[PDB]
């Protein structure tokens, strides 16, 4: 199976002289120190939107083999508090986890669960706590971590839950990562990261002025797709307004 890493798109920022003299004098901002950190963050989000398009593409190749729906709306004769109904999501994860380790016969896999932080909030179901609401002590999300990066240890697998708001709300995604180096499921290949300060390279739009060009070469490949999608239904917060 071949792996090819092609040249990617260059990101480059045109920098004249009078744009630097004006912004340093009028506002005290640099066009060489803010366009650079902008060029880095734009390039750092290509490699985190390619992955979302990758797993959306790789799940479509399997034709929905591991597709287990969950309903935030409880069943019509559940009749208890709908908070503890969201403990069912912990065993729709483990039901599709053991479905992976049964077909692909894996017995050493750590799993990772990527999904919307609005959707992965249902995994711990941690309740509130209270204190004095004084203006002198405002904790601006000081202890908030468990909605983006959470660890888990079930009886069927370990998990390394990841929450990022870039993936669309509505579904989860479970990826198998085996530590046995012979077997491989999804590998990310960063080739190089090249940046030049002009260096003879011109500009595409206005070639008469200098520019700072940069690009990074990378690809990500799938040898065998072990991926599942938990379709979380009716998670618009209307479980109590019905």
């Amino acid at each position: 199976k071949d792996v090819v890493i092609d040249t990617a798109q260059h990101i480059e920022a045109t920098v004249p002289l009078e744009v630097i003299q004006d912004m340093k004098a009028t506002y005290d901002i640099d066009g060489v120190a803010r366009l650079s950190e902008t060029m880095s963050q734009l390039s750092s989000q290509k490699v985190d939107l390619d992955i979302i398009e990758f797993l959306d593409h790789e799940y479509k190749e399997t034709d929905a083999k591991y597709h287990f729906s969950f309903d935030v709306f409880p069943h019509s004769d559940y009749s208890a508090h709908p908070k503890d109904w969201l403990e069912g999501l912990r065993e729709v994860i483990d039901h599709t986890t053991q479905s992976m380790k049964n077909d692909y016969k894996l017995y050493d896999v750590q799993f990772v669960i990527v999904g919307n932080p609005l959707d992965v909030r249902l995994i711990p179901n941690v309740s509130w706590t209270f204190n004095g609401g004084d203006r002198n002590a405002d904790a601006y999300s000081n202890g908030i971590k468990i909605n983006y990066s959470l660890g888990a240890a079930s009886g069927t697998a370990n998990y390394r839950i990841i929450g990022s708001d870039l993936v669309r709300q509505g579904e989860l995604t479970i990826i198998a990562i085996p530590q046995q180096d012979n077997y491989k499921t999804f590998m990310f290949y960063p080739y190089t990261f090249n940046v030049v300060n002009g260096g003879g390279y011109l500009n595409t739009r206005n070639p008469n002025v200098p520019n700072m060009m940069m690009t990074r070469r990378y690809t990500v490949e799938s040898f065998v797709p072990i991926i599942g999608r938990i379709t979380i239904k009716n998670n618009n917060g209307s479980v109590y307004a019905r």
């Binding site: 902008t38 939107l49 979302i52 398009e53 708001d165 870039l166 669309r168």
Partner: peptide, 11 residues
């Protein structure tokens, strides 16, 4: 606008 048109999965 840069952080708007990028934060969308069909890039």
């Amino acid at each position: 606008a840069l952080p708007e048109s990028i934060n969308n999965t069909p890039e």
